[PDB]
Amino acid sequence: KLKLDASGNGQAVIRFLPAKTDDALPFAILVNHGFKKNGKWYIETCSSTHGDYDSCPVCQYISKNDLYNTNKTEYSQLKRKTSYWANILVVKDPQAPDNEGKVFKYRFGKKIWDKINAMIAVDTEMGETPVDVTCPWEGANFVLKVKQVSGFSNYDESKFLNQSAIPNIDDESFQKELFEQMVDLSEMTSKDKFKSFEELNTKFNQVLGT
Amino acid sequence: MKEFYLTVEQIGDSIFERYIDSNGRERTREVEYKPSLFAHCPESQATKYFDIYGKPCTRKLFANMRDASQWIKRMEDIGLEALGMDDFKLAYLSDTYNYEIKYDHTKIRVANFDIEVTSPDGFPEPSQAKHPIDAITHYDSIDDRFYVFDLLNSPYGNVEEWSIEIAAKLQEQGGDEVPSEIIDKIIYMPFDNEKELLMEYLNFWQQKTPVILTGWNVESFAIPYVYNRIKNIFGESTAKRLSPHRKTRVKVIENMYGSREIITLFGISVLDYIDLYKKFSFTNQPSYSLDYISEFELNVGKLKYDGPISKLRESNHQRYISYNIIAVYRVLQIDAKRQFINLSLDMGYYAKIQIQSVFSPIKTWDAIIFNSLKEQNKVIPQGRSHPVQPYPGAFVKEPIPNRYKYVMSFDLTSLYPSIIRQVNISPETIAGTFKVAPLHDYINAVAERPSDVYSCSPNGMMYYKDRDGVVPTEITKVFNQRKEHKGYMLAAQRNGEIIKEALHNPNLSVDEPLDVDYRFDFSDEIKEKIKKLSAKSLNEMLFRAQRTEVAGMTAQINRKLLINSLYGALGNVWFRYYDLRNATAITTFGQMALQWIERKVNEYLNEVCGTEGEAFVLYGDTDSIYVSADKIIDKVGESKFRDTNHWVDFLDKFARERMEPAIDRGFREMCEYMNNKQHLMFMDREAIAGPPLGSKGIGGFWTGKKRYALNVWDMEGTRYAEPKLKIMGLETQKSSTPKAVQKALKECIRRMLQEGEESLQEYFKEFEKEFRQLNYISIASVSSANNIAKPSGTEITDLIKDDVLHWMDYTVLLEKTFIKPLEGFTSAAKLDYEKKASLFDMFDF
Ligand SMILES: Nc1nc2c(ncn2[C@@H]2O[C@H](COP(=O)(O)OP(=O)(O)O)[C@@H](O)[C@H]2O)c(=O)[nH]1
Numbered sequence A: 001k002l003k004l005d006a007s008g009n010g011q012a013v014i015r016f017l018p019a020k021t022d023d024a025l026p027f028a029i030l031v032n033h034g035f036k037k038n039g040k041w042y043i044e045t046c047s048s049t050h051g052d053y054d055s056c057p058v059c060q061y062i063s064k065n066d067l068y069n070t071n072k073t074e075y076s077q078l079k080r081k082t083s084y085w086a087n088i089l090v091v092k093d094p095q096a097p098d099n100e101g102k103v104f105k106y107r108f109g110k111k112i113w114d115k116i117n118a119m120i121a122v123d124t125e126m127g128e129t130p131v132d133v134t135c136p137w138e139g140a141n142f143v144l145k146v147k148q149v150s151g152f153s154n155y156d157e158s159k160f161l162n163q164s165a166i167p168n169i170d171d172e173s174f175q176k177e178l179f180e181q182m183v184d185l186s187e188m189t190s191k192d193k194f195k196s197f198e199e200l201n202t203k204f205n206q207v208l209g210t
Numbered sequence B: 001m002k003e004f005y006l007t008v009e010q011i012g013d014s015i016f017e018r019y020i021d022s023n024g025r026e027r028t029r030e031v032e033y034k035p036s037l038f039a040h041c042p043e044s045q046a047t048k049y050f051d052i053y054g055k056p057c058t059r060k061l062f063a064n065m066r067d068a069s070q071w072i073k074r075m076e077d078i079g080l081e082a083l084g085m086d087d088f089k090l091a092y093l094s095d096t097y098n099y100e101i102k103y104d105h106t107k108i109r110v111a112n113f114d115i116e117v118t119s120p121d122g123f124p125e126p127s128q129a130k131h132p133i134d135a136i137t138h139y140d141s142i143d144d145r146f147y148v149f150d151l152l153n154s155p156y157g158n159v160e161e162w163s164i165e166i167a168a169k170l171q172e173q174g175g176d177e178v179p180s181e182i183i184d185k186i187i188y189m190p191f192d193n194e195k196e197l198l199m200e201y202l203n204f205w206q207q208k209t210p211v212i213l214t215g216w217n218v219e220s221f222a223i224p225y226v227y228n229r230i231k232n233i234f235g236e237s238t239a240k241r242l243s244p245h246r247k248t249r250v251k252v253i254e255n256m257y258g259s260r261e262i263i264t265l266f267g268i269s270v271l272d273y274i275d276l277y278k279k280f281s282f283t284n285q286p287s288y289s290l291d292y293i294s295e296f297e298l299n300v301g302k303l304k305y306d307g308p309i310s311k312l313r314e315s316n317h318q319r320y321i322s323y324n325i326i327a328v329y330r331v332l333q334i335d336a337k338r339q340f341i342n343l344s345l346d347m348g349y350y351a352k353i354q355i356q357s358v359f360s361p362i363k364t365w366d367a368i369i370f371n372s373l374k375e376q377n378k379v380i381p382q383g384r385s386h387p388v389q390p391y392p393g394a395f396v397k398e399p400i401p402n403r404y405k406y407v408m409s410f411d412l413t414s415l416y417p418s419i420i421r422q423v424n425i426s427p428e429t430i431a432g433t434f435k436v437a438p439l440h441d442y443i444n445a446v447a448e449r450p451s452d453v454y455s456c457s458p459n460g461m462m463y464y465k466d467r468d469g470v471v472p473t474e475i476t477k478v479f480n481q482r483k484e485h486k487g488y489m490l491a492a493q494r495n496g497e498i499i500k501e502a503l504h505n506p507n508l509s510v511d512e513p514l515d516v517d518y519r520f521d522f523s524d525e526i527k528e529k530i531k532k533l534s535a536k537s538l539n540e541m542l543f544r545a546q547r548t549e550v551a552g553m554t555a556q557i558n559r560k561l562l563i564n565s566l567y568g569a570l571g572n573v574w575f576r577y578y579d580l581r582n583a584t585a586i587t588t589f590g591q592m593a594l595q596w597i598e599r600k601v602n603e604y605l606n607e608v609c610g611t612e613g614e615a616f617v618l619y620g621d622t623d624s625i626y627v628s629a630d631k632i633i634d635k636v637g638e639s640k641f642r643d644t645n646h647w648v649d650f651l652d653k654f655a656r657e658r659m660e661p662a663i664d665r666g667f668r669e670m671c672e673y674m675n676n677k678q679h680l681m682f683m684d685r686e687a688i689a690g691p692p693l694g695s696k697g698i699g700g701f702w703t704g705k706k707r708y709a710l711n712v713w714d715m716e717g718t719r720y721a722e723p724k725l726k727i728m729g730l731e732t733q734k735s736s737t738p739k740a741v742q743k744a745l746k747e748c749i750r751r752m753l754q755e756g757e758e759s760l761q762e763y764f765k766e767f768e769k770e771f772r773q774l775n776y777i778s779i780a781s782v783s784s785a786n787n788i789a790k791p792s793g794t795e796i797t798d799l800i801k802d803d804v805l806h807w808m809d810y811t812v813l814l815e816k817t818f819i820k821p822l823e824g825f826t827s828a829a830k831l832d833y834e835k836k837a838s839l840f841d842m843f844d845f
């Protein structure tokens, strides 16, 4: 996760760990909803991850009363949110050094993801540009830099460094004893965590006052 | 919420659906549907699609359907297989409803109606003008009213406009109190001519466009005609108004010595309730003339009509039109307790087929197997062109016509589906073949086990044991589904009762009915909640319980009919999955199976009875066999049994405890002999039959194959108080035999079976007199040619009567339509209907 300079900024260097092959890729995608009214904090995966988008009561409730046009305030609260989930490797962390070296999970939305994107060929021709990253032998390290000053929320000065290997890899020990600590992703996108439409309308109920 | 279709067609290059939307409103989208078929490809392009045989396949998205149709046409001349669902309407509905369809029968518009016509002949003729269209009464499950159409004048006939108050009579026999109940629904609006009232229907048709149009012989008479006529009046184009797609087609269906013509209204589902009755009412009466079926189901033959058939028009209208309602209402009355409409809907939305396709099992199953496979990314093979070749049917034992005192039958549990499972037969499960010995060599366990590793069949087919079959799998699917819903039914049932127990002394308060699932036995915390409940809610709940128990029934009867029809397809060439090697495999197995248990039974029974060679099994017909249990009776000796129940208990105790177990070890071995996949041959006692104790009754007799009668005292565990006379095809209620005579024959059999040759001889006497003095017509034969001289001949003229009612001659009019019948039963039973002049007696010693 992320700590703060007791000011609104914050720094740290993170590296996303990739899975070998035949295994759950280094990127799991999960969508969900999030709102609270009447003490009804309703936060549930959204089925928009699958070919659902309708058995998912929120999206359905969203379209049926199409709120984006008759109450934008409400829509903003119940719109579906994607959270690219990926295993990482905290490199440096001045505010919570304990995480150093340790393997964790990081919930990061759009912005950051769209950053591995422009880390390959397709971004400029003529002179060419760099190749790849997120693999244990050749990849960069995002230097998470947050800036909250008279502006608005977190910042985005983080852009990984330069193509470089991972300290102590060729070793069998740190080899498997590394992938292990990795919560390899597919449990994120599955029928493991669910719960009905009852939870939605107990939460929804009491906004109109009926 | 979730929507659902109503009808779907493929007019041209796009599907023409017609459904109930999200808000629950009827609609009619159009869709340039883009179907996708499949084609084999190298395991190089390897995808996620495969055929039942495991070959990897590849998708093929088409622009339009005709684009796809022709692909097939081409692929066929080319020489390659075109996999995938080629019935687009099927494929459409499939993609369109990728989920278990829940429907609201309410929103469905079911229209019931009949036709009233006239002619100087009697039997009108569709596909001809001469539409005199006396009257027409349409119905509508939504408004719940009858829309009667009268014709006060025209070119032929006139006057006497219906009398709402004058409900066809009173205090007599010319009214029948037609409007028995509820008159908010009869809506007499005939405008006073035909030239206009014949079209008014169209304007009506558009105000209440029919979704399900059933009535009596509507598919062949009304509609086919109600189309022809208007056509010749307002023009063909203005005749297709009966179709929400203006569109229409004709399809002539040839018969034996004759043929008619059927017309189809695209975007509609015509279910001729008669045809719905023939198929979903296992009785098969003599002649479904609806002046009997009704008198059967509702238990009354009505209208008590007295007039010249064919000419009754001028007779009246206060009694004429009154008919053109009870009719369109009686048909409605039957379905009320038969539920064949509800049955049909529950089939279609399950299959995902056009509701009017329940009359086609090949299709219904095709759909079902399709969808099951679709979900697995498996591709349904292409339907080939096989030559129609006949194959061995069932095994019916030529019984020795005789009488049988005690008899026990053992029927086999859904044999042909079970055989399919046990053997695990399917187009793709085919493993190989084997040197096949004579069917009877296997029967007698003399041929050598066909295989050591494959599941086999008496015909030479081998199947994989470690591998599920597409077909077997789907039957096991449907089978578990019947087991499933039946449980709901049983619980809703059990729940209802719990409710009914709580109706005595209900709490006197104002409350509401609980929100609970009736498919599950009420919890303790509802059994209680329910008591405190008020008596207005309970009654409401009990309705709901029933609404359930009943929904459960239907839902599980269909799963049954579904199972009982699969073989009926698997043996049909038009069926995608048809295959001779397997059509035969199934039957010839069932062949070996029956004859095998026949053996094993006789074998075991001989032993127990300390003898050898005696054939205890008197005869089986396909899946069931009948066993003579006389010798087992004697083993205890007739004189010893407290009464009749005692014996029955005894014979049930036995065969519950001694036979069935001997029967299973019998089949278990057969399973192993044929190295089957899983033993599923389950034969169980059925009916225990015999003559009352101390009675000189014959018990039961057989005169031929599927021709006999028994005195049944208990069927599948349930003991009857008053015996039941099972009578298998002895030509009793024959369509040409007077009910009076009919009933006699029934009595004759009863008495033979119970009370003996003496009693039979007494009754045979009573009825001989009881016959000599009957009615005028009734005993009368009936035929015709074109017309009769200036009923047909008798009516009565009071010139020839005196001489006729004195020169008829019951002698022949009896020993021709009772004695002939009787002769056959008694001869086989080895008795006489009238004390034969003894003979040997004169050899007095
Ligand atoms: N899976 C499958 N699809 C078929 C078959 N026959 C036709 N189709 C077509 O395949 C399309 C569906 O492909 P789909 O099942 O959505 O692929 P996935 O979505 O299963 O990969 C439908 O629109 C059908 O018209 C079949 O036998 N199996």
Ligand SMILES: [Zn+2]
Residues within 6 Å of the ligand: A033, A045, A046, A047, A048, A053, A056, A057, A058, A059, A060, A080
């Ligand atoms: Zn959602």
